[PDB]
Swiss-Prot record:
Residues bearing the modification N6-acetyllysine: 23, 39
Positions of region (Interaction with TP53 core domain): 1-185
Full protein name: Gamma-interferon-inducible protein 16
Positions of disulphide bridges: none
Cell location: Nucleus; Cytoplasm
Family: Belongs to the HIN-200 family.
Effect of substituting residue 92 to A: Impairs DNA binding
Cross-link (Glycyl lysine isopeptide (Lys-Gly) (interchain with G-Cter in SUMO2)): 108
Domain notes: The HIN-200 domains mediates dsDNA binding via electrostatic interactions.
The protein's assembly and partners: Forms homooligomers; isoform 2 can self-associate or associate with isoform 1 or isoform 3. Interacts with TMEM173, AIM2, PYCARD and CASP1. Interacts with BRCA1, TP53, E2F1, RB1 and SP1. Interacts with MTA1. Interacts with PYDC5.
Outcome when changing residue 95 to A: Impairs DNA binding
Domain HIN-200: 1-185
Amino acid sequence: DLKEVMVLNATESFVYEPKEQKKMFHATVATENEVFRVKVFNIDLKEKFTPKKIIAIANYVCRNGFLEVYPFTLVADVNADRNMEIPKGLIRSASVTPKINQLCSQTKGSFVNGVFEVHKKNVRGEFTYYEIQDNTGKMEVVVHGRLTTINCEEGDKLKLTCFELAPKSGTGELRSVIHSHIKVI
């Protein structure tokens, strides 16, 4: 089951389940051939997921195109003599923000990552709506719950992690879900 990977980046840690204060973080890792987004539900594993570190992983769970790391998952250290080298081809193709017009072109559901410019902001009750826009188009980001407490003004840019892309009658939409994360630039 063993995958040896290089850690590209990792977010800060945050609460996704409030009642028992369970925390997680997000990470991106790579083999020579593939980039993987990772959901890490054991916070004590933070040091192990440091940028440029080489690690070995087995007994992960696969769900919605993420690898999920739980206590039954083996995460081990790899010796220096592995000399892992990731082709820059793979790593640039890594963190590419999709164009909004293709996002509003999908009917299949997915979970998206990317840096988007904040065009407009509207608050409706327990809901915050961001309109995002690029050279190809625009669409709304629907935020409910915990992520509404992070402040973001017009003109700012947002690094979104694990947003749900949902098709509408007609148009697409992005919505916060339980593992979503926002970073403001």
